[PDB]
């Protein structure tokens, strides 16, 4: 009997992992990695947030069991998530139209949503922005759902091309899912304005789309409440939606895998039926979600003092990113960049497309030790006041 | 437009969750829940193990980041898992034939294995024992794999009917997966002897099956090394196999979701190809696994002092279960049971089938506040020296 594994073709190597290996091995003291995928502070560290350490100490001192929770995880975490998303006092919450399952990250939320849709609805297609989070396609395709792209970013002019977006979505059919990033669009940082969100929400009702809001950076754009405006505009207008949320970034809990999938339906009975089937999708996967990260989040959010410490930290991170965006633009100018980069201070979150070509990206790495991913995506949290001048001089040199 | 969720039918209610509801609403002081699915100590608690609290303190003191790990999780956890499974001095490990992905529980391991097999191999069918762990069918079916049942337990006579088992497996074709519980068969507690494992391993080689060993109770049967004998009998004989392992029960880490999927192939280059595609299946699911529980396990297993504290606790847990099995049988006899329950003494792990009818189970709950599941499965860890006499009196009364 030939082996079952004998003829498996290897998956393609992950180019980003390859770059990370090269960076690690690079002995040049001037090296900088703008290709990283997480927040870093001014010292280049991704620390554990103080509020998180305090919560972890409280859990250590008070947890008396690790017995299983249900398929939806920790109820307090679900309620805290819903309040962050919709606002405490939301008519949606008051009307009992939402149910939330804690999941292993936003990634887990997306897969659970995909499996739920594929097994229980007539959804055939999920529409995602061009560009979008790289992992969206694989997740939805794994559930047998087709993924189509809609127009979003104008790369030459560095804008969200809203008219192109709405026209391209005329191809989406009633009952298709259309996925929108809630804030800090990844990787462009180009977000709809509130008025644009309101236009999209109205269009979505008219066309019969099922919106799926992927929100992974609440608090990184303009603030917690502001960053939820787009989601809340959809929530005001729709009978149904799905939200995939993550606490990986805004709580610095990346490796603990903390996020949620929230269903909204027209009434309590409907959302309960749908949620029962979502649970079934979870039961066929990992069953119950990982407790530690969700416990941490619930511990912080339910305590006024800890919550204040967390909010201040998150504010500090948002403001550092904004400072680096401003400093990057000003430093490119002082280093004599031969074109305008002001789009950088019109974008939200830690990611933007630099507008550099793959050739310029390669040259930056080989000649200057400045690392970015092939798409030209850069993470401004990889910038500091101390590394800004040489990295801008390098960029200017390849333009 | 009509709702996408409007015509979703509710999943059928989970009878066990309902029984847990009824238990909570039952105000009678003498209630005993033999229907639980986790370990409990002599006080009725599911404690955090001492070794686990110590490891958690160490992590709180020493962790400086929660940045993402890779798709396979914490390397040290993978190595420690492989050593527990295959033993020191494993030729298989020396030959670099194994790769392990940390996963969200044994459940996550089974789903990752299922998705990997469905997308990368010609496997069409997975064979499981009648009875088996309740979630096996849903997990494999979710990946598009047919699940077939093989003979295992003679309920009237309380035996592993080995001849029925091997004859029933003549229907399994070359290339099919056959799933075996590594130890403490759930829910019968009836395990193959070493000689029987060796016979199964030889048959598997002859027939060309791909074995999947699901091991979730290592340490609860006879002890860590003994409980791995069956797996190791297969390992010695096979070019390829899959192991889904769990630390939920033997580290009391249920809600942290810590387990692993281990692939074994003929050689290192082959297992690397296979594992690359397993990582792709993970990427399309929840991406990286939850760190906390795996960090705890690695911390314990890689430190001699902590490991000894863990092993001692686990031994105490195993021995308490064995003592309750003996005490149950002896108390039933002293209370005048009209039937022999000696089969209980021999069975391994926390679960056995009581042999009680559904009518007897109903009466036990309604009249005596003794709770078992409809099948008559009991968890002997729900028994204590203090509750044993009333429990046995109730059972004798319904016989």
Curated annotation (Swiss-Prot), chains A, B:
Please list the GO terms describing molecular function. Answer: identical protein binding; L-aspartate:2-oxoglutarate aminotransferase activity; L-tyrosine-2-oxoglutarate transaminase activity; protein homodimerization activity; pyridoxal phosphate binding
PROSITE patterns found in the cross-reference section: AA_TRANSFER_CLASS_1
Changing residue 377 to A has the effect of:
Reduces first-order rate constant about 10000-fold
Q: Does the keyword Transferase apply?
A: yes
Cofactors (names): pyridoxal 5'-phosphate
Give a yes or no for keyword RNA-binding in this entry: no
Q: Which reaction does it catalyse?
A: L-aspartate + 2-oxoglutarate = oxaloacetate + L-glutamate
Residues that the record marks as modified (N6-(pyridoxal phosphate)lysine) are: 249
- Record-linked InterPro entries: Aminotransferase_I/II_large, Asp_trans, NHTrfase_class1_PyrdxlP-BS, PyrdxlP-dep_Trfase, PyrdxlP-dep_Trfase_major, PyrdxlP-dep_Trfase_small
Spell out the subcellular localization from the entry: Cytoplasm
**Keyword vocabulary terms for this entry:** Aminotransferase, Cytoplasm, Pyridoxal phosphate, Transferase
One Gene Ontology cellular component: cytoplasm
Q: What is its EC number?
A: 2.6.1.1
Gene3D superfamilies membership = Aspartate Aminotransferase, domain 1, Type I PLP-dependent aspartate aminotransferase-like (Major domain)
Instruction: Give binding positions for L-aspartate.
Output: 37, 133, 186, 377
**UniProt-listed Pfam families:** Aminotran_1_2 (PF00155)
Q: Name one GO biological process term.
A: L-phenylalanine biosynthetic process
Q: What induces it?
A: Transcription is increased specifically in response to 2,4,6-trinitrotoluene (TNT) and its indicator compounds 1,3-DNB, 2,4-DNT, and 2,6-DNT.
Altering residue 136 to N: what's the impact? Decreases to 60% in maximum rate of the overall reactions in both directions
CDD domains per the UniProt record, alphabetical:
AAT_like
| PANTHER family reported for this sequence | ASPARTATE AMINOTRANSFERASE, ASPARTATE AMINOTRANSFERASE, MITOCHONDRIAL
Quaternary structure (record): Homodimer.
Family note: Belongs to the class-I pyridoxal-phosphate-dependent aminotransferase family.
What is the designated name of this protein? Aspartate aminotransferase
- This chain's source organism reads Escherichia coli (strain K12)
